[PDB]
Every structure is written in C-alpha cells, then in structure tokens.
Design a protein around this nucleic acid. Structure first.
Lengths: 81, 79, 86, 61, 212
RNA sequence: AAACUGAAGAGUUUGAUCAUGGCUCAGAUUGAACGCUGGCGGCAGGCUUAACACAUGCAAGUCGAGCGGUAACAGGAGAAGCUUGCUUCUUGCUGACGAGCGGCGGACGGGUGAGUAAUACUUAGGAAUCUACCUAGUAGUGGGGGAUAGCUCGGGGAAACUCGAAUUAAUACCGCAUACGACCUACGGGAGAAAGGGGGCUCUCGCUAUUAGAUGAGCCUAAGUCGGAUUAGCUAGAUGGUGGGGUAAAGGCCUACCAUGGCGACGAUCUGUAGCUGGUCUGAGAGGAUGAUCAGCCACACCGGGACUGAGACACGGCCCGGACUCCUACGGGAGGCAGCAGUGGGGAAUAUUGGACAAUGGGGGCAACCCUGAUCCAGCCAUGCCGCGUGUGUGAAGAAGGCCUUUUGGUUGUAAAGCACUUUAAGCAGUGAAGAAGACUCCGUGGUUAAUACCCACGGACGAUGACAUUAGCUGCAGAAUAAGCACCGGCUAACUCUGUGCCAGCAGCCGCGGUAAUACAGAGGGUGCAAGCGUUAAUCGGAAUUACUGGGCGUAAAGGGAGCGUAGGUGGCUCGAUAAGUCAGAUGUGAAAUCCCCGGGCUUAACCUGG
RNA sequence: GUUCACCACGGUGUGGUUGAUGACUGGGGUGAAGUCGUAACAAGGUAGCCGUAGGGGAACCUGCGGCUGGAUC
C-alpha cells in the first residue's frame, strides 16, 4: 500500500528525517511518490523541528495512504500547537 | 493525440501506406539544421490515397507489427 | 528447498497444481466439444454443446482456473461462430 | 619487458620477484620501466641518505 | 600542523617584519639581521623572478597569520567565490580568524601565543544574538559582526595576558575592535577594511600566484 | 537582494632570426597502489582483477483469535508410593507449543553488471490492460457433500526419503441455492460466488461479486543515444490483409489462405565494444573524459531449458528436466550453488570483522502480546580521502659549545639551544552527564456504536515500560613540556647553494641534458626551499594544446587543391506583391524525481558534514 | 500409460572470421677505428627532380615526355 513515513538522512548519529509518501515495498530511502515535509529529532528551541504539508497529508489520507506510527504522532504533536 | 503530416512514398500494401515525415534536426555541436525524414507506416482502411499525396496521420494503438498510425486527412493529391 | 516453509510451499504447490490441472483439462474438453461441433457445421449440435460449455467455462473462470476475460472471450467468439452457422 | 635498476648496487638475480613501475630511461633504447627498490625482493640502496624513499631505504636511526 | 622552529629567519627570508616577536624591543636590535636572508649565502646574484615575488608575498601573508597551505588555499577559494575583490576578502578572512582577533585585541603578545591561548580553551566566544559564551579551542574560527570574546574565569589573572594588554596599549588598538581591559572582554564590531589594513601587503601578488 | 566572476605560459630544431611543427613541463582530479615516515578527532570511502571456486555461521518468517491436536515446556486440579515434607501419575484443564493441514509473506528488502547497440535508457506522449494489502461505496456471506495431512497398522530404503491399507478437522476442496453490480447475448434471455473466527443480539477481523480511487505492473509511439564501409546490400512469418487461435491487454504473438511486400549511404546488414541516467572529473566557456559510493531504470542469480503457485515470478537463499563441478554412499542411489552479510582459498599492485542490536527509521506476520529482519542503526580495521587540532608559549647574547664554510679569522646554524617564566588543546586519569524515545501497557473522561451504563472505534488526560551504540556527546577537575615530524627538492623551466668524494666510472634524468681531476646536475654533508601527518613516485583523465580550431586553425613555397571536366544525391541560391506559420521569436501551461552544482540562510565549538528556501 | 507435435542438451559435415606459433624469406630501424664506391648539396664537376621503360655490385645510369623548385648566359 501507500504509506507516509520517514526517510532517514542527516549523518551518523545526527538523523534528519524527511516525511515522504511512498509505496510500501520500496526501500526506506529509495523511490517515493511525494515529499511532504521533514523532521529534526535533534533541534534547538528556536528552530523548525517539524514541518508537514497538511493539505497534501489530508489528500493522501483520503486517497488511501496509511501513516506510520511515527509520522502519525508527529502530526498529533504538530497540530496541537 | 499526435498528428504528423507528410507525403505518401508507398501505398502498395492493402490498407497500408508509408508516409515520409520530414523533420529538421539541429546538429548538437555545429548548430546547423539537417533535413531528416522517417518512414511511418499508416492505416489506409479504404485504400483511398495513392503514392505522392500529402496526407496527415495520427497516432493510435497498434494495427499490425509496424502500423500504429492511421490516416486522418488527405489534404492534397499528386499532379 | 532450504527452509521448512520453502518445502511446505513446494508440496503445497504440487497439490494445488494437480487440483487445478484437472479443472483446466475439463475446460479444454468442454471447449473441444464445441469446436468439433463447429468443424462439423451443425448448428443444432454446436448450440447443444455450447450450452454445456457455458456453465463450465464461467464456473472455472470464477474458480480462477481461467481468467474471466478468457471465459468472456471464448463465450463471445464461440457464440459468434455458432450463430454464423445459419 | 626490460626494466631499469636504479641506485648504486642491487641484489637482483635470476628468478628474483620484483615490482615494476613506469618511466623510461632516456638513453636506454627499449627500457620503458623502472624496478621499485625495497618493494618485494629488490633491496633498498645500502647507504642512501638523501632521496631514500625513491630507493626504498629505511630511515637511519 | 603549525610552524614550530625559529621565527626570525622567517622575517629574514621575507625581508620585512612579520610581528613574530612581542614588541618588547625593536626588530632591528632583536636580530641584528634582516639585511640578509637566512643561511650561508643570503644576498645573492641571479635576480628574483615574478614567480619568486608571488611566492614570497604569499609566504609573507601565510607566516604573518600562522596559516598553512591547505587552509590558506581554502581561504583563497572562498575569497574568490565571495562577491567582491578576492584579495580583499582573503585579508578579511585572515583578520577575522579568532586567534588573530584575540591578538589584535591584545590578550596575546604575539599571534602564536594568541593561538596557543585560544587552543588551550582559555578564550570564550559569544556569537551575535546568542546569550551564552562557549569555550572554543579552534583557532581558525571566523567571527561575524558583533561577536563577543571573553577570558575563561579560571584564567583571567594570567601573568602573560596582563602584559600582552600593556603591550597592545603601546602597539595600537584597531577601531573595529572594542576592548574592555577591566572585564577582559572584546567585541568584533566589524570586519577590517583594506584602508585599515597596512597597504604594504600586495594581495594582487597572491591573486596572480593562485591563477596558474 | 543573490544565484550573473572568467582565460598566463616555459624549454627544446639555428652561428643567429622569424615562422611552422611535434615532443616535454608547470595545474586539477582518484574507490588508487608503491617507497619513506606517521599523533589525534569528525565525516565519508574501502575486490576497480576471477559473473573464479567456495569451508562455517547467520541473511524469511509469522499466525493457536482458521484446524485436528500435545512432541517438549511451564503451571493447575485431583491419584497423594507420602519416602512427612519426601513426592509422583492421570488429565490440552491452562500458559503455550515441535511436527502437520491452512492463510499471509517469501516477486519486497539485499547483491552483481555477465548479457544487452536496443523486448535497454532519457525525454515526451498514447490506449487495448491487469492490479494482493490500502481508501470510499454497492449486493451478499444460504444450505449440503465427499475427502485428506498429521495420528494409526504394515512394510521398502545406508541415507535422501518412500510404498500400501485404514482414517479425523478446517477460513482445505467440490456440488446445490440465490446475484446491486460484473460476464455472454441473437439482446428474447442465458449462465457465474462465498467461510468462518473473535469480544461482550450486537460490534469486529474476515470471505464473495463488483464500481471508483490510489499504488504497482504489462503494452505502444516519436525523438535522442559508441566505433568500423579495409562491412552495401539485408529480409520469406519476411512486409501488409482476411478468417481462426492466443493474451489480462494492442500486435505475425501463432496459424491457414491472399498479395508482393518491408528495411537501407538520413548507414540497413554484419562486426567490435559497452549496462543507461541523474550525475562525476577537467575546462573561462564550448567542449573532452567518465558512469565507484547516493538515487532512478534495466538485466542477471553455477550453465541451458520448461513451467507451477500466485495479485504479482518464468522466482537470488522455490519446483522439474538436462549439463559441468564439489561432496556423501552400504555402490543401489543421493545432496549442493555467498553476484545477501561476515569469512576462506585463489587471482592481483591493491581493498576491511567469521562484531552488536532490533533502541531508532522501515519491511513481513499477528487482534494484540510478541516474533523475524546481516535492510537498517551502530561498532571494528585501514592516513584511502576531505576537514579540523596538536606536537608547546614568551623571554633569552661577550651571539656558548659542536657541525659547516672561510681570505684563519670571521660568517653561518641562530633566540636557535641552554638558563629563566609560564600554558595544558589533543592523548592519559577521575568524575559528572544530555539528546537520540516516538510515553507502550494500565487507569479515568468524552464522543461514536449498540438493546445496552458492555465490546469495539476515535479523541483527551494521568502514569513512566522501553538505548545496541555506551565506560556516549558535552561539561568539570588532576598531572606535567611532559606523549607526538617527516618527506621531496635546491643547473634551467622551478622557490632554494656551497664543500668533500668520484673522475664520461659510479651514477642522475620529465625535457634540455649532467659526469673528462677544482661537477651549484652523481653520492655524502652543512645550509636552504616547499609541503607537512603526511611527502614523493607510478598509473589514469582533462588542461595547458587555437595540437581536429563550433566558440577557435590551415592548404603558392612549411603538411595540405582532386590531372581536368560533366554531373547524381545533397548543400546553397535574384527582385516585387500576397497566402501559410513548419523553422525562428515571444508568452502561457504541463513536465524536466530527489540528491548534486550555485545563491541566500540555519545546526554541529569551527570546518568538513547536515539542512530550509 | 501409450503415441504424435514442439523443443533443450548432445552429435555430424562443410565453410567463414580471427589469435598464437612456423623452416625459410622480404624490406624497416639501431649499433663502431668496417669494405666498395662518390649519387645529392656549388653549374657538386654529365643541372637537378617527376612519371615511365630498360640496364646495372651499389649509390645509380640511359631513353622518352614534363617541370624550374636551374648556374651561366
């Protein structure tokens, strides 16, 4: 199925995830359908740690995409603010 | 769709014509344009056009091993 | 096969394939009946064989032995050729 | 092929396993390679002091 | 790495004073040389060439700031990538180096001592906007506009900074730096200008050396 | 605002000159090797050769909430020999669970580049298709049957395994019954499903037929896409058509018949080489070279061939047949495939550990609990690269001694040393110590659901179960200059010069050349120059080379006008008034993946690196 | 099960392309106190060179035609 998950980038011991819509069978960092945000696990209090296009996220939800438990909680903690 | 225009260089098949599609292609290094032509086999269901006519063909699904274009408009006949 | 599940899938494949081959052969013989009737040019016999080929064709197509598209194609084409026999 | 043994003195003989690099000798016709001194069986130059790495000579202590 | 050997023969090879010794006494009596470069021969025949001039100027700047070739070539690469005159930008970077800034602010008698002061985690830096000092040990840290420099509380009473200050008083304090001796603090208010830096370093020679 | 910035020449033909013209050099780069040397850290990279052969371990399982069950295991209830606190035998009763039937997965993820010059790739489009899981709907899920694996009974086999009789369950299999859609229709009518499980009549996980999405896959078209003509003609299912078959689907995909077509100097055919791309290197650019690591596409899985199951494979760790090779064998027969991760042998100039954890991001299974995951996240080794830091810092002269040179007395090594005064980065020792974690479970409340205050779903709180790395990053103390410098070069190009030895020898050398008894060119020493934990050499690409010249060269005599003409294809082409809008120009729209490059910012102490636009 | 069709391995025959080697043989180059001459450069001592033919140990010579990239005139 289509999933919304995180593709790891950054560097060793300093991850930086990209929130991507992807075919489930593809590699985590491989081919994806749309990049709809990012996530900085380690970040400073005065810097954007989570950005995520809500319109495209909702479009893919209605369309059939299944978020992972990480991106789902990321939206959970990003829309409550 | 996609429509090409060219002369009929062959018609001696049943429901089939070859169309000469001229094109200008620019040399990647020397900048001049060279006249280039491709022969496209088209479908001539009613066997109307003869060789030498200027016709228009349009892309369709394959009809035969090498035929995927069909005649859509005969615009001019030979003299 | 190197793992237990690979071996199990192998023997399962054998059983499934025998079961399906019997039904594929049945489809082929009910179609050969209609083909022989058509080759004889006998409208009555062709229709009578076609009426028994129909509920085997589209029943094994539902089972998956052939595709629904194949069953529909054979149904339509055999009916066309039979109706062509006066 | 023919290769040149540079430096003063060498231990090479028949059936000696040597390492060969590029670089022709200007005044030797047909010699287009140099023998690496200190590589496999070609010993370095004994009392070399200045350009020792070019002749596989260890640093005197 | 860094140069460790004798420093006055560097100035002797350059033919000028590189500030490699504290200004406790004039450069002339400090060496009784600098009429001739180091070694046996010194004053030679077979006059220098354009490449010799370019190399000597580049080595002059490199030895002034204690920076080696790989770092200095990255400096030139960035200076030519940056908008503006390449030599001006290279001099601006070399003057914005943290060890040179603490030297110019007077906490080290010479640039080598200022570098060894920065490297030993005795100098703290506060980036503009940040409300916190951090102890840094990287001498080649560039400072932006408004960066603050301070001395670690553990080493504010140093018997070498307490005369580096009085020596900087006799040598002269740049305007683009603001120094408070009482609190042993400084501010890098602006990168220095080519009209403030001495007009005896020919950076055109470096820019023409770095063009094959 | 910005992305808009970029271009050097020298030596060598001559007695000398100018030109021509080759050769050589200074630069940058590398998955590099080698020689000498070697302190540390961050981040990357690491079999380019034998798609050679592979010992050993691991790389794909999971579900008992589909099923019969009970091999082990742990309990629980009773039999209690009770041996009085020893202790056993019956029971699937429970947690669970080996093998077995069943489902889902194993078609992904991972590897390699052999084949492939085009069923490939890139760009742009198309129509004649299928699509498990996921999203939203629609119609249902009714009622029967015959089996069978395990389990038995008896054999055969050295093993691998196997043969027969009996025989139980199911969401296994097969009829029958209905059918909103769906399929065929001559449009009158015909035929086609399914399966149950779970929580307290409901809800839920399922199953069936199907519609629209989304995803993925298959198919088609046009253009672009290496060298050779000392390869010019190539094709007979060939090119097109009809009827038939075949496919999920167009189609000579196949077949019978009919016609004689199709392709080719705009390079067919035949040959050599090769995975293609984003990109990478070089270059002022245009170009030239290239296709490691990261990402897309393709192909392959010991070699050849065939298919099965399935939504998807003609299947890397599946099947069958054949082959070569290795192994086992009781000689009758059997087993296997590291181009998964480690690792071995071998080849090579040359490329690493038979490490840890699923904590994080993902993937498979499951209602969950949880299990699996050599993907991945980490750790190990290696100066292989890039970046950063250190090996101390000041002061110190009748300018000590020693070395070297010298006009024999001066110069030089040189503030260099010593002596004094300090400092402790990195390494070491001791402490402290974030972040990577997403808050599982449980409890409460709210809303939906319902016959229901249940169950389930979602939302909101409380709670702290969860870290391989790891003795973390960082931070703070202690000690003491203590633990830390080599390499190449020094005639010119090309920065840096003298002695001694040697005597066209020994040797050097990229080129020009040097070496003959006073060698700044050999070898050693002083001194210096350039780089610096590296420095040289070799290999290789571009550059300089305007030396294939498009940008941007030439042909009277330096290389170079065909012996001359006629002419085919092709290239190019007068004046004026119109049409057209193909080229051309402009605009809009869609696309040109991301990463990379460049510009503006942001985060690691800086930088490398990461990252937003 | 049998039989036919298709087909992989394997086999047979006849050619093509191409690598390595081959007695011997051809020219090309490099090497020094060699042998034989002296063909070219000056009008190089018969101007040279080009095509072609014949001849000659060898540079070459001779004929025919051509050229000036020929002195002297």
């Amino acid at each position: 199925m289509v999933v919304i998950r995180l593709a790891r980038g950054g560097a060793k011991k300093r991850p930086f995830y990209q929130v991507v819509v992807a075919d489930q069978r593809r590699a985590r960092d491989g081919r994806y359908i749309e990049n709809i945000g990012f996530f900085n696990p380690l970040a400073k209090e005065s810097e954007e740690a989570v950005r995520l296009n809500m319109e495209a996220y909702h479009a893919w939800i209605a369309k059939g995409a299944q978020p992972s438990d990480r991106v789902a909680s990321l939206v959970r903690a990003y829309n409550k603010a | 769709a996609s429509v090409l225009t060219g002369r009929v260089v062959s018609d001696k098949m049943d429901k089939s014509i070859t169309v000469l599609i001229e094109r200008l292609v620019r040399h990647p290094l020397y900048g001049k344009q060279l006249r280039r032509s491709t022969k496209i086999k088209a479908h001539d269901e009613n066997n109307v056009c003869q060789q030498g006519d200027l016709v228009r063909i349009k892309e369709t699904r394959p009809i035969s091993k090498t035929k995927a274009w069909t005649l859509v408009d005969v615009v001019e006949k030979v003299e | 096969a190197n793992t237990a599940q690979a071996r199990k899938r192998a023997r399962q494949n054998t059983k499934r394939r025998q079961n399906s081959a019997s039904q594929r052969s049945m489809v082929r013989t009910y179609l050969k009946r209609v083909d022989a009737a058509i080759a004889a040019k006998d409208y009555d016999a062709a229709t009578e064989a076609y009426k028994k080929a129909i509920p085997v064709l589209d029943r094994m197509a539902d089972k998956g032995i052939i595709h629904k598209n194949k069953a529909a194609r054979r149904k339509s084409r055999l009916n066309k050729t039979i109706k062509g026999l006066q | 092929v023919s290769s040149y043994i540079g430096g003063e003195g060498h231990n090479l003989q028949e059936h000696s396993v040597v390492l060969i690099r590029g670089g022709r000798v200007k005044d030797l016709p047909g010699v287009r390679y140099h023998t690496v001194r200190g590589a496999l069986d070609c010993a370095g130059v004994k009392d070399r002091k200045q350009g020792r790495s070019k002749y596989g000579a260890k640093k005197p202590k | 790495a860094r140069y460790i050997g004798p420093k006055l023969k560097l100035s002797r090879r350059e033919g000028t004073d590189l500030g490699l010794k504290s200004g406790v006494k004039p450069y002339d009596v400090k060496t009784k040389k600098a009429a001739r470069p180091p070694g046996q021969h010194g004053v030679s025949r077979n006059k220098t060439s354009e490449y010799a001039l370019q190399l000597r100027e580049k080595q002059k700047v490199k030895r002034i700031y204690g920076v080696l070739e790989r770092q200095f070539a990255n400096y030139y690469k960035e200076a030519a990538r940056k908008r503006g005159a390449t030599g001006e930008n290279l001099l601006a970077m070399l003057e914005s180096r943290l060890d040179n800034v603490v030297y110019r602010m007077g906490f080290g008698s010479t640039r080598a001592e200022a570098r060894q002061l920065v490297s030993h985690r005795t100098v703290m830096v506060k980036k503009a906007g940040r409300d916190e000092f951090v102890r840094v040990n990287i001498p080649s840290i560039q400072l932006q506009d408004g960066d603050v420099i301070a001395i670690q509380e553990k080493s504010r009473e140093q018997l070498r900074i307490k005369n580096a200050i009085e020596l900087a008083t006799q040598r002269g304090i740049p305007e683009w730096l603001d120094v408070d001796h009482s609190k042993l603090q400084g501010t890098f208010k602006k990168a220095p200008d080519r009209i403030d830096l001495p007009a005896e370093i020919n950076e055109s020679l470096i820019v023409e050396l770095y063009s094959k």
